Amino acid sequence: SFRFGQHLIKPSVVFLKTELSFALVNRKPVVPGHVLVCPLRPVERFHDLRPDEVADLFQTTQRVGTVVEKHFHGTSLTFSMQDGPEAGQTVKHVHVHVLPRKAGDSWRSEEEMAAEAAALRVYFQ
Amino acid sequence: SFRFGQHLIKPSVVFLKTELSFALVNRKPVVPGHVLVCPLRPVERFHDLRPDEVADLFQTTQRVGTVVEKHFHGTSLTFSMQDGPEAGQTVKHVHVHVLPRKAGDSWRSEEEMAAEAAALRVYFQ
Numbered sequence: 243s244f245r246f247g248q249h250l251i252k253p254s255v256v257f258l259k260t261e262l263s264f265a266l267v268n269r270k271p272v273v274p275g276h277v278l279v280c281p282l283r284p285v286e287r288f289h290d291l292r293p294d295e296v297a298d299l300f301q302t303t304q305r306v307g308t309v310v311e312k313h314f315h316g317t318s319l320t321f322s323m324q325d326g327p328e329a330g331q332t333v334k335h336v337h338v339h340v341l342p343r344k345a346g347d348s349w350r351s352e353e354e355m356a357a358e359a360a361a362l363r364v365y366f367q
Numbered sequence: 368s369f370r371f372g373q374h375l376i377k378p379s380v381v382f383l384k385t386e387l388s389f390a391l392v393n394r395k396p397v398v399p400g401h402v403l404v405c406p407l408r409p410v411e412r413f414h415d416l417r418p419d420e421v422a423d424l425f426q427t428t429q430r431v432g433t434v435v436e437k438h439f440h441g442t443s444l445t446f447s448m449q450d451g452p453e454a455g456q457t458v459k460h461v462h463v464h465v466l467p468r469k470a471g472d473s474w475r476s477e478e479e480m481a482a483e484a485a486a487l488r489v490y491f492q
């Protein structure tokens with residue numbers, strides 16, 4: 243299961259899932275700890291998600307942010323939603339990019355992704 | 368009134384204000400329509416705002432996003448929270464940056480800011 247634009251994302255890669263949201267790992271992480279949080283519903287633009295699915299995606303992000311900046315040794319994070327194609331979007335889903343940051347600071351197998359997912363899954367126990 | 372890091376922001380510059388959030392204009396907008404949304408409470412890092420003040424700031428942002436991409440003729444927006452100094456933060460407040468975008472796409476007076484604020488204030492009537 244798990245939708246993400248035109249393609250599905252395997253549970254094996256999903257490390258969090260809420261009532262209205264779900265979080266997963268990037269196949270090509272800009273930096274380590276790069277993880278996304280997208281609404282469960284596959285709406286293409288922000289203003290499309292209800293006001294409920296707007297709290298969940300961001301309350302979740304909140305966690306996913308603190309559970310990833312931790313496990314990757316960041317000292318802060320950078321969040322950024324690319325809404326609309328003039329914004330740079332390429333997957334047609336609303337979704338937040340959470341990246342853990344380090345002072346003056348990538349492709350990988352499904353299996354390696356399955357581990358990153360598995361590792362993180364633990365901080366949400 | 369209106370706190371924003373070490374300094375206060377004038378109402379004249381605030382174009383929206385909710386129960387837990389407030390929105391205002393930039394003195395040095397990266398691009399036109401650059402406007403911020405910061406929690407009413409002056410907490411310095413994301414994970415510090417309650418789960419309530421996390422829904423408001425982002426439900427609000429939602430609007431402020433659609434009321435600004437509209438009035439500045441954008442075809443989409445770019446949202447991005449700089450959380451933590453390793454992220455680039457410089458004002459020690461949680462706060463979202465909403466910028467309206469246009470295809471392949473600044474200092475100003477309090478008064479000019481007071482107008483931008485005034486103009487926008489109208490879409491929230």
Ligand SMILES: Nc1ncnc2c1ncn2[C@@H]1O[C@H](COP(=O)(O)CP(=O)(O)O[P@@](=O)(S)OC[C@H]2O[C@@H](n3cnc4c(N)ncnc43)[C@H](O)[C@@H]2O)[C@@H](O)[C@H]1O
Pocket residue numbers: 246249250251267268269270272278320321322323324329330331332333339341447454455
């Ligand atoms: N099936 C699938 N499985 C797994 N992944 C998939 C998938 N399908 C698609 N995907 C995957 O899902 C993703 C689709 O997302 P997307 O297409 O919307 C890309 P974006 O939204 O434009 O990116 P950012 O703005 S966040 O990127 C810029 C970030 O770098 C940071 N940054 C860079 N330089 C900085 C600086 N100097 N200072 C501060 N921050 C800086 C910014 O703060 C910002 O957060 C793809 O990765 C795809 O492979």
Ligand SMILES: Nc1ncnc2c1ncn2[C@@H]1O[C@H](COP(=O)(O)CP(=O)(O)O[P@@](=O)(S)OC[C@H]2O[C@@H](n3cnc4c(N)ncnc43)[C@H](O)[C@@H]2O)[C@@H](O)[C@H]1O
Pocket residue numbers: 322329330371374375376392393394395397403445446447448449454455456457458464466
């Ligand atoms: N008293 C006061 N009154 C008024 N204003 C005040 C004030 N005090 C402080 N302030 C004001 O309040 C602000 C304090 O905020 P801040 O210090 O946290 C700066 P930041 O968070 O690092 O910025 P962004 O990441 S959003 O910036 C990068 C943005 O550009 C976009 N971008 C750039 N290149 C891009 C590309 N190639 N593709 C997509 N997006 C791109 C990104 O998507 C992103 O949203 C200051 O402006 C200050 O003067």
